[PDB]
A paper describes a structure:
The LRR-RKs HAESA (greek: to adhere to) and HAESA-LIKE 2 (HSL2) redundantly control floral abscission. A receptor protein called HAESA is found on the surface of the cells that surround a future break point on the plant.
A Hyp-modified dodecamer comprising the highly conserved PIP motif in IDA interacts with HAESA with 1:1 stoichiometry (N) and with a dissociation constant (Kd) of ~20 μM. We next determined crystal structures of the apo HAESA ectodomain and of a HAESA-IDA complex, at 1.74 and 1.86 Å resolution, respectively. IDA binds in a completely extended conformation along the inner surface of the HAESA ectodomain, covering LRRs 2–14. The central Hyp64IDA is buried in a specific pocket formed by HAESA LRRs 8–10, with its hydroxyl group establishing hydrogen bonds with the strictly conserved Glu266HAESA and with a water molecule, which in turn is coordinated by the main chain oxygens of Phe289HAESA and Ser311HAESA. The restricted size of the Hyp pocket suggests that IDA does not require arabinosylation of Hyp64IDA for activity in vivo, a modification that has been reported for Hyp residues in plant CLE peptide hormones. The COO- group of Asn69IDA is in direct contact with Arg407HAESA and Arg409HAESA and HAESA cannot bind a C-terminally extended IDA-SFVN peptide. This suggests that the conserved Asn69IDA may constitute the very C-terminus of the mature IDA peptide in planta and that active IDA is generated by proteolytic processing from a longer pre-protein. A N-terminal Pro-rich motif in IDA makes contacts with LRRs 2–6 of the receptor. The central Hyp residue in IDA is found buried in the HAESA peptide binding surface and thus this post-translational modification may regulate IDA bioactivity.
Residue numbers in the entry:
A (entry chain A): 18 to 46, 50 to 615
B (entry chain B): 58 to 69
């Protein structure tokens, strides 16, 4: 009864110091305070924990909550607690074990007196505020602290060496602050219990200190977004419980530790965007691996066959390296591959036939390699695909029938190969198709009418093929179509006359075909058309005056059968090359019409 | 908020 009274009064006093526009604390306005929202009590009915996470509360830190004599846990995670932290705010909070002030609006410095006022803390988070000035050196006096998270503030100076004295720490998160360029303090190697070290975006320079080899309980080492130099040290390989290594966007050089293969516990490894050389380690037994990213390095040699031992692998991004050889033939048969990006390497041989064996593959990105042979019919049934980029390889044969109509396929990029065949009518199934990029192949036959039913299409790019027959009238009501490029084909017939459907058409390129008829007047009323190339066809009649409405980066009507006069806006000799090779055409200058 | 401790999402 006495404790319920005490508790209720202190909680209400604290609440009076806050604004509650969401009415999150309506229960604090008949019932025991032990059953109020966010409030937990011990068996003597004293408040032990207040958790107001995500309650949309506004105002200064509610110091009054610390007057609850048994309060051990306080969370104000994700509110609008504002102003600054004063020394005084925490004077009475000395019983706290847990304090979470993350994701608020706090500004100013961390009080230097905080460890003295909060000497029992095991858990301190003040991530995602606007804290400035340095991390106080007094933080080295915490005797019990297990986790410290100051990530995502504007803290500056350098990481204090005294944090190495807090040998109870298991997690140290200081990522995304505004520190001066400095080395990781050697003294952090004294934190021999550390499981998480997150110093991403900390302006770190120099090598990973050798003392960090004493952190044998590391589970997550994340030093991303710094300018760390030298080798990735081979001691990471001997961490018996390591699950995640994140070292991307640094200046690491040398090779991947040769014994990486034995890291059976490793789930995620990313050393992308460094200056690594040499090979991917072989004899991989990476049983728990989910993600391997090594893109934008200078790696050479093959993808080892032993990658196929990673039966939970879902992400493999190796793009922009100097990797060579054939891919392991079994890649993806036994892995839930989701994102595969091996672009800009020198891989050869066939695309592994079961890359989508488990039906999870979303991105297949293989641009700029020397892959050859045909696309497996398997991929024709890979219904999870959203993004396919196979351009600039040595691929051939017919595309699998179902590939054209995959239901989630957004980008279909096949350009600069030697594919043959006609586009089937089953392209009608590609409901999500945004970009069709198939230029520079040997595709034949007519562009199917059904492409006009795919309302989301923004790009149809099919230049340098063997397409023939007519442009389907249906293309003309693709309301979102931005780029139409069917240059260098064998297309015939006319351009449709009614083009107001093409409100987003920026580029119309039909150069080098067998197209005939007049240029429709409505070409000039297209509101965002900046590129118009109708050259090397058999267009006849007069150049519509509406073209003078457009601001064209490219206008090319050369090598046609056009007649009459050039529109006056283009009468100057600098435009002449836009109209060459139209015997019937002339320019009106000074009275006479000149060829 | 803050970028998570996780893999780079960059891709072609
Ligand atoms: C690889 O990682 C490096 C870090 O090693 C990273 O470099 C960083 O890039 C960011 C974002 O481009 C830079 O931030 C900028 O800093 C300049 C001033 O120096 C300003 O243009 C901006 O600062 C604004 O900050 C406030 C926003 O909170 C604004 O209110 C204010 O008015 C400023 O305009 C901008 O944020 C940063 O300087 C570097 N960091 C370092 C340590 O060099 C690089 O981008 C990464 N590379 C890749 C390809 O990912
Ligand atoms: C921070 O708190 C806000 C407010 O409670 C959270 O926003 C709500 O998110 C849930 C889904 O989790 C939705 O049902 C609500 O509609 C959201 N409300 C508002 C006002 O946006 C937000 O999720 C929390 N942020 C974090 C990072 O936890
Ligand atoms: C915390 O700092 C952030 C980032 O500087 C501030 O967020 C916005 O910053 C941009 C410029 O980068 C401005 O357009 C806005 O005016 C800022 N937001 C506002 C005024 O709400 C943010 O203001 C800072 N928060 C506090 C409480 O000072
Ligand atoms: C207008 O288009 C014609 C082709 O339709 C261009 O002429 C070709 O230009 C290339 C140079 O890259 C030559 O290899 C071809 O032999 C040319 N073809 C013909 C039929 O002459 C012309 O350059 C374009 N003009 C402008 C100003 O862009
Ligand atoms: C805290 O936020 C409220 C509402 O946005 C504002 O009226 C109040 O003055 C703020 N206090 C400080 C110190 O910024
Ligand atoms: C704390 O760390 C500093 C800086 O490394 C060191 O010189 C000092 O001896 C340590 N003191 C205590 C009490 O742990
Ligand atoms: C991996 O191999 C090296 C020796 O090459 C060894 O130091 C390390 O402890 C091994 N790691 C595991 C997890 O067995
Ligand atoms: Mg091998
Ligand atoms: Mg293309």
């Amino acid at each position: 009864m006495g404790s319920l009274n005490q508790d209720a009064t202190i909680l209400r006093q604290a609440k009076l110091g806050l604004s509650d526009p969401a009415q999150s604390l309506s229960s604090w306005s008949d019932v025991t305070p032990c059953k109020w929202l966010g409030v937990s009590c011990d068996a003597t009915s004293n408040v032990v924990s207040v958790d107001l996470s995500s309650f949309m509360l506004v105002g200064p830190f509610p110091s009054i909550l610390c007057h609850l004599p048994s309060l051990h846990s306080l969370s104000l995670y994700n509110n609008s607690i504002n102003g600054s932290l004063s020394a005084d705010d925490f004077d009475t909070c000395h019983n706290l074990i847990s304090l979470d002030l993350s994701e608020n609006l706090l500004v100013g410095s961390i009080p230097k007196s905080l460890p003295f006022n909060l000497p029992n803390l095991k858990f301190l988070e003040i991530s995602g505020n606007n804290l400035s000035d340095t991390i106080p050196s007094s933080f080295g006096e915490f005797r019990k602290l297990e986790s410290l998270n100051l990530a995502g503030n504007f803290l500056s100076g350098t990481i204090p060496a005294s944090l190495g004295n807090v040998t109870t720490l298991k997690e140290l998160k200081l990522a995304y602050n505004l520190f001066s360029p400095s080395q990781i303090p050697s003294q952090l190697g004294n934190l021999t219990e550390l499981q998480v070290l997150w110093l991403a975006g900390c302006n770190l320079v120099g090598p990973i200190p050798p003392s960090l080899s004493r952190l044998t309980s590391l589970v997550n080492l994340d030093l991303t977004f710094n300018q760390l130099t030298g080798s990735i040290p081979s001691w990471i390989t001997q961490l018996k419980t390591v699950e995640q290594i994140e070292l991307f966007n640094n200046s690491f050089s040398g090779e991947l530790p040769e014994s990486m293969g034995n890291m059976t516990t490793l789930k995620r490894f990313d050393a992308s965007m460094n200056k690594l050389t040499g090979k991917i380690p072989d004899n991989l037994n990476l049983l728990n691996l989910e993600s391997l990213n090594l893109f934008e390095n200078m790696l050479e040699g093959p993808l080892p066959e032993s990658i196929t031992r990673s039966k939970t692998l879902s992400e493999l991004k190796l793009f922009n390296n100097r990797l060579t050889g054939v891919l392991p033939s079994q890649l993806g048969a036994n892995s839930p591959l989701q994102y595969v990006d091996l672009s800009y390497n020198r891989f050869s041989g066939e695309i592994p036939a079961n890359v989508c064996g488990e039906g999870k593959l979303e991105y297949l990105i293989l641009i700029d390699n020397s892959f050859s042979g045909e696309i497996s019919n398997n991929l024709g049934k890979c219904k999870s695909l959203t993004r396919v980029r196979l351009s600039n390889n040595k691929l051939s044969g017919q595309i699998p029938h179902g590939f054209w109509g995959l239901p989630r396929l957004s980008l279909l990029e096949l350009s600069d190969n030697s594919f043959t065949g006609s586009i089937p009518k089953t392209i009608i199934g590609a409901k999500n198709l945004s970009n069709l990029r198939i230029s520079k192949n040997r595709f034949s036959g007519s562009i199917p009418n059904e492409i006009g039913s795919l309302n989301g299409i923004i790009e149809i790019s099919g230049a340098e093929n063997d397409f023939s027959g007519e442009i389907p009238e249906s293309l003309v009501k693709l309301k979102q179509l931005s780029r139409l490029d069917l240059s260098k084909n064998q297309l015939s017939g006319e351009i449709p006359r009614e083009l107001r459907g093409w409100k987003n058409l920026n580029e119309l390129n039909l150069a080098n075909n067998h197209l005939s008829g007049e240029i429709p007047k409505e070409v000039g009323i297209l509101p965002v058309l900046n590129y118009l190339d109708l050259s090397s066809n058999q267009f006849s009649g007069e150049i519509p005056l509406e073209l003078q409405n457009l601001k064209l980066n490219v206008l090319n009507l050369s090598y046609n059968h056009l007649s009459g006069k050039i529109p006056p806006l283009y009468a100057n000799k600098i435009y002449a090359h836009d109209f060459i090779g139209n015997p019937g055409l002339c320019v009106d200058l000074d009275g006479l019409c000149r060829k | 908020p803050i970028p998570p401790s996780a893999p780079s999402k960059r891709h072609n």
